[PDB]
Amino acid sequence: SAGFDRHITIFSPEGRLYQVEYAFKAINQGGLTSVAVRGKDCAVIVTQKKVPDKLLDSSTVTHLFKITENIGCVMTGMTADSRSQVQRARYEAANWKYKYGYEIPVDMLCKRIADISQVYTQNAEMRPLGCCMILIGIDEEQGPQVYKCDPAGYYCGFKATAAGVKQTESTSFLEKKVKKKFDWTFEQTVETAITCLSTVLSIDFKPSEIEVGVVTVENPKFRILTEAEIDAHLVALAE
Amino acid sequence: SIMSYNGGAVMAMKGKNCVAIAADRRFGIQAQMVTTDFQKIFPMGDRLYIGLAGLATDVQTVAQRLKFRLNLYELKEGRQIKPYTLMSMVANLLYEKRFGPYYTEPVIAGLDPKTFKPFICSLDLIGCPMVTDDFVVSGTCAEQMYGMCESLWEPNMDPDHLFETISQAMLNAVDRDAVSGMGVIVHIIEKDKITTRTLKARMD
Amino acid sequence: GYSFSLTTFSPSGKLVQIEYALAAVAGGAPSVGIKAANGVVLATEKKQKSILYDERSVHKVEPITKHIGLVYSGMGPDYRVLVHRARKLAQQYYLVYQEPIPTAQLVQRVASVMQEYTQSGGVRPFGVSLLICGWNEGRPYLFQSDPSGAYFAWKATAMGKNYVNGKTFLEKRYNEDLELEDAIHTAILTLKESFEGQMTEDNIEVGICNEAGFRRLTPTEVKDYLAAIA
Amino acid sequence: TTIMAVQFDGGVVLGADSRTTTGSYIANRVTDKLTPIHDRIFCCRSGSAADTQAVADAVTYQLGFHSIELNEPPLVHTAASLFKEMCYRYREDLMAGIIIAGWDPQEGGQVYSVPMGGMMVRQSFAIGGSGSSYIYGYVDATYREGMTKEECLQFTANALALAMERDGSSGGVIRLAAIAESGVERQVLLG
Amino acid sequence: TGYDLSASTFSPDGRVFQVEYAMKAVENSSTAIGIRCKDGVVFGVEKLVLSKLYEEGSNKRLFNVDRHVGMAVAGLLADARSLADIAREEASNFRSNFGYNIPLKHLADRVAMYVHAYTLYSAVRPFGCSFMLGSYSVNDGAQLYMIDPSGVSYGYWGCAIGKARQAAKTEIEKLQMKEMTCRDIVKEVAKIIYIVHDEVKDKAFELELSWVGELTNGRHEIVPKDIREEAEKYAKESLK
Amino acid sequence: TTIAGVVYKDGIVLGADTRATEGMVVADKNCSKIHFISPNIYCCGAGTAADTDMTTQLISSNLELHSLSTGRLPRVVTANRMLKQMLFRYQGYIGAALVLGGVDVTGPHLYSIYPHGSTDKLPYVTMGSGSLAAMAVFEDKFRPDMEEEEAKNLVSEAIAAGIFNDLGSGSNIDLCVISKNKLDFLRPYTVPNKKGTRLGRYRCEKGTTAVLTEKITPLE
């Protein structure tokens, strides 16, 4: 190679820089995969858990993180960087309500998160937070939205989302899935959010190995599903 | 008051295609005069002047700070300054000393740099701008200057009758004031030329 | 041994790191700016990776004031920094002078911002060049900055991938005066010159400067121009 | 200005007049003197208008951020602790007459008093304001331990109406609120 | 390797070895375990005598953070002392700003974010400690937490920190801890320490047992094992 | 100084006058007291004239910064929260009395802001020195959900009550009608006070003033 040894955050003669694009493979040491789907008035997060020990608890494992009453998120990547990322998200959501007097849009929150990650690329002397964040929320006169924020400081909004280890396989499914014209009537959404992940990993859980966050324009509160109603939808797509 | 420490009077008046500005000449401490050639009207570019009245410290101080900001403006831009732009510049300079304010009340008169359009405005001691269409006045003898200008002003006046109106306004109002006088200077500017005259006033 | 830092010279020539940052501009999306007789046309290239991405989320043509627009070719996340810088810097003129800032005056100041990250010694320069447009005092303007801090004025130019084809195209393709409409027809024709796929209303994104202000086009407006576009 | 707070078995009952005056002129004829903080905790404010509006927005910012971290409903004693910290620190600068009341899952109904000094105390019932001195001997001859909710709505309505009849800075219209485990019942009364 | 000097740099596959290096410095520390019953949390530390001139209760690894919270540190002892003073100071600000005792779920979040900040910058290094957090309340029951040098913090029912981390929780999990009282747990902690490595490669050790729960009325203190001496009377019965 | 506002069935009508005095001398016969904030929000100023001017431009700068970054229409509660939090920090040293009005997605909203930082949401407010005279017309002749011309007639009547009280104006009653889609702004809505004509001969002569020293300087 030309071989700058990429020790700090400077350029290469090819034109790119390697330390930030080493953080994209820093997500993959979580050993995890997450999916968000926006089809209609509802939006669904789905993510598996991995409990390796019986001494380890169950309630303190969940990656679903409630940011505000109407905005929830899911975190991938390594664990310790993910929770500190959430603390800035909870903090700056409350400064919006204080400064501006109304509830923050889900679109504006990813601009604030990505700009914090941008400074760590532009200015040196802080490790750039190897974790990824996926949001959901309801916006009036806009419907529901799904956003992803990258460690580079990139964000975009899009319908079907994969993160973790198996992006390219799961996104290959959803292109084949979301090319037709469906109406996604809240059990159409949850079923595909399972069955996009239910071509990929070849697992078979009894219904206690995932988490599902949901939001809906009938109750815009963020909502983590019950183990019983997870079992309901797991045999409702499923005859 | 502090405004009544040295006296002063500045008047501007709008004509047809021209504009006139006048001031007194007396410098003095509260009752004792010192000299009769104190400048209170300063050129800011061509066809655009400014007049200052109030505390004679802040008259000379603001006129130097404003000249400091003007020359930096006219070098980052090849154009000269517009009359509205100067009024916004002065009101910024006065409001920065919001609680330590300069004791002066400026009067700006000038033409448009592109067209022929006249412009007059005056400001408070903290920077409230006020544009008019007939006349603005400032100084200690303000009420005497309102009584003359409300009666003598006409809408569309040549530079001849504009000169005679602001002369009769300044001579009669200042002679009723005690701490203003000792000569009156008049600038009358227009598109083609600039005329400066000094009047025959009471030196008492 | 000189290609790792910024605060020192090479024994013969110039700074190495600024030249490497200009290589990042060449690997960006293509973009075209054309100064017409009565207006300025900006145009860029917006292809998403998959079908999943929404096109109405992130924009390229971006207003700064009501008569000042701005595009780029480089890295998108660094672009959002100096946009928000140029917004707040445009208001500071207006708080002082009570007058909309002329387009020559921002590019004095925005380049002085991009100046400051080329200092010592633990910061990186930007990887974004810009194209700035505006209609101030009748005559329009079309400027271009760079991560070094220089700034110019083009009749027409192009940046991004395959720009040398677009340079040779527009070198043959410019005259002194066309109308604002014919500038749009020739700005889409040069974006089509280096493209891969069916150019639709969502693959491109176009904004213009009238003398009546800055505006970016809706997809319906951009469809009807691209409909029967030569 | 007269404010009122009585706890009962289920929850608490709040009440106030309106009549925001300035000297001898009524600036605001009808005024929300009681303010939501969380879903179960209100406060009614007295003293300077611009001071107590600024304090209540800061406590709502701090308490609202604090419960999202814990993923728990906040305590009423936690909310009364935050007003004490701002009033004791920024004394000699504020004139605040805050009374905090509301239902809590751990403890039921509670009423706290934060006067202009900066102290904090729990009471069975608490009044405050300029016209509070007039009904001040009526309230402890009429109070009785073990009331229902409908008695307390009757109790505070007769209590506020005597000061509103009498004090010149008080009057206008009666705004009431009942906070329990179920919900919040707000109503506007005249009589 | 050749990418692992600073903690501010990534590896070419995407991890930080300075965090990886500091974790296995805790691995060389002696074993300290923790376990919670249905009405309390019981700690236990295998601590070995340095030579002979130790004075029977010096430099203990059972700390006391708050009125109802204590630690069970293992690793670099001096690094844990400074880290314990962060937790002592953190509970005082919550008391002063909110007027009641710190919840353990919130206390572990405040400490782990402080541990996280030493994993980012090149000027400082990560901590070489890991520890336990136990508490008890009547509105919350008993909780038991666990903090690595990276800052990952969540809850267990039983845990172990030291050399025999795997070799201890192999036989923690064969206990029906959901229904045992913590007075029964104290004699059961005693055998788990005493099973693993009494004097094989070492010479001598001494047992320390901390104790919080409903029987202590929410207080956290050391066991009275000078009273009744029932740990060693019952752990040494496993010789056969 | 007399400013007033009202909320009719569709939007908000604001009103003001056109006098600035210094001491007891009329300094300005025509002063614009209704200030721009956003294309849906306007504000009326009372109190110190320079304090209201510099404040109403700062918040109008930040909402233009905020809405252009957001990409949608501003909210009136955002402008309320910026003003009441700014003025509280200066402890009432900045003497500014403001009437804030605009139409949001939620609908019309009218506020009144005091220079210490206390705000009130009301269907109708009056501020200024002649506010007591204008509140007489509102409290006598307000009914909820009026029509367009019924509201414009009420505010023009209420401002005129303050003008024929002292410290009124060299009357040019101003109106700003804000609706959900249409925005109006009327400087000479009603001119009741006309200056009488001048009946004297004031013959000036070209040479009736003695000149000591003349000076000519050409230009280009």
UniProtKB/Swiss-Prot annotation, chain A:
Entry's Gene Ontology molecular function annotations: endopeptidase activity; NF-kappaB binding; purine ribonucleoside triphosphate binding; RNA binding
Function (record text)? Component of the 20S core proteasome complex involved in the proteolytic degradation of most intracellular proteins. This complex plays numerous essential roles within the cell by associating with different regulatory particles. Associated with two 19S regulatory particles, forms the 26S proteasome and thus participates in the ATP-dependent degradation of ubiquitinated proteins.
A GO cellular-component term linked to this record: proteasome core complex, alpha-subunit complex
Source organism's superkingdom?
A: Eukaryota
Question: What family, per the record?
Answer: Belongs to the peptidase T1A family.
The name this protein goes by in its record: Proteasome subunit alpha type-6
Where the protein is mainly located, per its record?
Answer: cytoplasm
Residues making up the signal peptide according to the UniProt record: none
Query: What organism is this sequence from?
Result: Homo sapiens (Human)
Name the SMART domains on file: Proteasome_A_N
Query: Do you know which CDD domains this protein is assigned to?
Result: proteasome_alpha_type_6
Q: Where in the cell is it found?
A: Cytoplasm; Nucleus
Q: Give the gene name.
A: PSMA6
Tell me the keywords, alphabetical order: Acetylation, Cytoplasm, Glycoprotein, Nucleus, Phosphoprotein, Proteasome
Query: Which taxonomic lineage does the organism of this UniProt entry have?
Result: Eukaryota, Metazoa, Chordata, Craniata, Vertebrata
Q: Per the record's keyword annotation, is Nucleus included, yes or no?
A: yes
Subunit record text: The 26S proteasome consists of a 20S proteasome core and two 19S regulatory subunits. The 20S proteasome core is a barrel-shaped complex made of 28 subunits that are arranged in four stacked rings. The two outer rings are each formed by seven alpha subunits, and the two inner rings are formed by seven beta subunits. The proteolytic activity is exerted by three beta-subunits PSMB5, PSMB6 and PSMB7. Interacts with ALKBH4.
UniProtKB/Swiss-Prot annotation, chain B:
Q: What induces it?
A: Up-regulated in asthenozoospermic sperm.
Task: Please list the GO biological process terms of this entry.
Answer: proteasome-mediated ubiquitin-dependent protein catabolic process
Q: Which residues carry this modification: N6-acetyllysine?
A: K76
Query: For this UniProt entry, what is the primary localization, expressed as one broad class?
Result: cytoplasm
Source organism superkingdom:
Eukaryota
Q: Where does it localize?
A: Cytoplasm; Nucleus
InterPro entries, per database record:
Ntn_hydrolases_N, Proteasome_beta_3, Proteasome_bsu_CS, Proteasome_sua/b, Proteasome_suB-type
Q: N-acetylserine (modified residue): where? A: S1
UniProt GO cellular component terms: cytoplasm; cytosol; extracellular exosome; nucleoplasm; nucleus; proteasome complex; proteasome core complex; proteasome core complex, beta-subunit complex
The UniProt keyword set, sorted, is: Acetylation, Cytoplasm, Host-virus interaction, Nucleus, Proteasome
Q: How does it assemble?
A: The 26S proteasome consists of a 20S proteasome core and two 19S regulatory subunits. The 20S proteasome core is a barrel-shaped complex made of 28 subunits that are arranged in four stacked rings. The two outer rings are each formed by seven alpha subunits, and the two inner rings are formed by seven beta subunits. The proteolytic activity is exerted by three beta-subunits PSMB5, PSMB6 and PSMB7. (Microbial infection) Interacts with HIV-1 TAT protein.
Q: Which family does it belong to?
A: Belongs to the peptidase T1B family.
Provide the protein name: Proteasome subunit beta type-3
Curated annotation (Swiss-Prot), chain C:
Phosphotyrosine-modified residues are: Y2, Y20, Y72, Y117
Q: Which Gene3D superfamilies match?
A: Glutamine Phosphoribosylpyrophosphate, subunit 1, domain 1
Q: What Pfam families does this protein map onto?
A: Proteasome, Proteasome_A_N
Query: What do we know about what induces or represses this protein's expression?
Result: Down-regulated by antioxidants BO-653 and probucol. Down-regulated in response to enterovirus 71 (EV71) infection (at protein level).
Similarity-based family? Belongs to the peptidase T1A family.
Q: Sum up the protein's function in the record's words.
A: Component of the 20S core proteasome complex involved in the proteolytic degradation of most intracellular proteins. This complex plays numerous essential roles within the cell by associating with different regulatory particles. Associated with two 19S regulatory particles, forms the 26S proteasome and thus participates in the ATP-dependent degradation of ubiquitinated proteins.
Q: What is the name listed in the Swiss-Prot or TrEMBL entry for this protein?
A: Proteasome subunit alpha type-2
What organism is this sequence from? Homo sapiens (Human)
- Name the gene behind this protein: PSMA2
From Swiss-Prot, chain F:
What superkingdom does the record give?
A: Eukaryota
Q: Which GO terms describe its cellular component?
A: cilium; cytoplasm; cytosol; extracellular region; ficolin-1-rich granule lumen; nuclear body; nucleoplasm; nucleus
Residues at the catalytic site: T1 (nucleophile)
Q: Might you name a Gene Ontology BP term for this protein?
A: proteasome-mediated ubiquitin-dependent protein catabolic process
Location in the cell: Cytoplasm; Nucleus
Q: Does the keyword rRNA-binding apply?
A: no
Tissue specificity statement from the Swiss-Prot or TrEMBL entry: Expressed at a low level in colonic mucosa. Up-regulated in colorectal cancer tissues.
Q: What reaction does this catalyse?
A: Cleavage of peptide bonds with very broad specificity
Which EC class does it fall in? hydrolase
Asked if the record carries the keyword Transmembrane, the reply is: no
What does the UniProt keyword field contain?
Cytoplasm, Host-virus interaction, Hydrolase, Nucleus, Protease, Proteasome, Threonine protease, Zymogen
EC assignment: the record states: 3.4.25.1
Subunit structure, as described in the record: The 26S proteasome consists of a 20S proteasome core and two 19S regulatory subunits. The 20S proteasome core is a barrel-shaped complex made of 28 subunits that are arranged in four stacked rings. The two outer rings are each formed by seven alpha subunits, and the two inner rings are formed by seven beta subunits. The proteolytic activity is exerted by three beta-subunits PSMB5, PSMB6 and PSMB7. (Microbial infection) Interacts with HIV-1 Tat protein.
What is the name of this protein? Proteasome subunit beta type-7
Please report the organism this UniProt entry assigns to the protein: Homo sapiens
Source lineage: Eukaryota, Metazoa, Chordata, Craniata, Vertebrata
Which gene holds the coding sequence for this protein?
A: PSMB7
